[PDB]
């Protein structure tokens, strides 16, 4: 939908990422593997949990109807009573539906940016050092092991440590050597 990610360029979610809502998958000399981003799932849960309790709180003053008894020749205020309570019970039933319909749209879109903002986070760290492969995934120039994955995972990668390594690879898969 709105933000571009879920059901977007990242075609399909993974069943293998069991521990959390968004996360990482890597592939290197040592292993392959999935790893949920807890930090940012835990932040998304905070926000959904708050949404759920938001509603609950908002409908404790909602219209309570205790009944009234009515006569044979009071028929037309008996009705007035019935028109009212049926009235309010329609107005609050509408409200409770529409709010859900509205919050559900907002919630599914909340995940949609959650994912994308993660990706763009990874992207802004790894710059020239990696290829944007265009399907949710990056391949590095410099070859990056497990300890170095973590840094990307926990957002403290170091560009100017693998620079040469990487830009020796850029330098060459640019066919620039091929003139000597």
């Amino acid at each position: 939908g709105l933000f571009g990610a879920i059901a977007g360029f990242i075609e399909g979610g993974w069943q293998g990422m069991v521990d959390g809502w968004y996360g990482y998958h890597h592939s290197n000399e040592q292993g392959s593997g999935y790893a949920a981003d807890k930090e940012s799932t835990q932040k998304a849960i905070d926000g959904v949990t708050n949404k759920v309790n938001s509603i609950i709180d908002k409908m404790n003053t909602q219209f309570e109807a205790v009944g009234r008894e009515f006569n044979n020749l009071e028929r037309r205020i008996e009705n007035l009573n019935k028109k009212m309570e049926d009235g309010f019970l329609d107005v609050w039933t509408y409200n409770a539906e529409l709010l859900v319909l509205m919050e559900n749209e907002r919630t599914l879109d909340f995940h949609d940016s959650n994912v994308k903002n993660l990706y763009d986070k990874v992207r802004l760290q790894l710059r020239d050092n990696a290829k944007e492969l265009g399907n949710g995934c990056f391949e590095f120039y410099h070859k990056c092991d497990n300890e170095c994955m973590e840094s990307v995972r926990n957002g403290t990668y170091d560009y100017p440590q693998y620079s040469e390594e990487a830009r020796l690879k850029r330098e060459e898969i640019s066919g620039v050597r091929s003139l000597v």
């Binding site: 020749l73 009071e74 028929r75 037309r76 009705n79």
Partner: protein, 48 residues
């Protein structure tokens, strides 16, 4: 046309809100009035 009032008028009209068809039946024949005079209950207030 002969003036007065209709006791509990609105309560009736409201009851008429739920009815889709009447059928007028005869409960007391005008002819069958015994030892009174049913014929001469007319008034110029209600001209026909």
């Amino acid at each position: 046309c002969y003036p007065g009032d209709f006791n509990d008028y609105e309560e009736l009209k409201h009851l008429l809100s739920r009815i889709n068809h009447f059928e007028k039946i005869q409960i007391i024949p005008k002819s069958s009035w015994s030892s009174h005079e049913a014929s001469l209950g007319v008034s110029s207030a209600c001209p026909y």
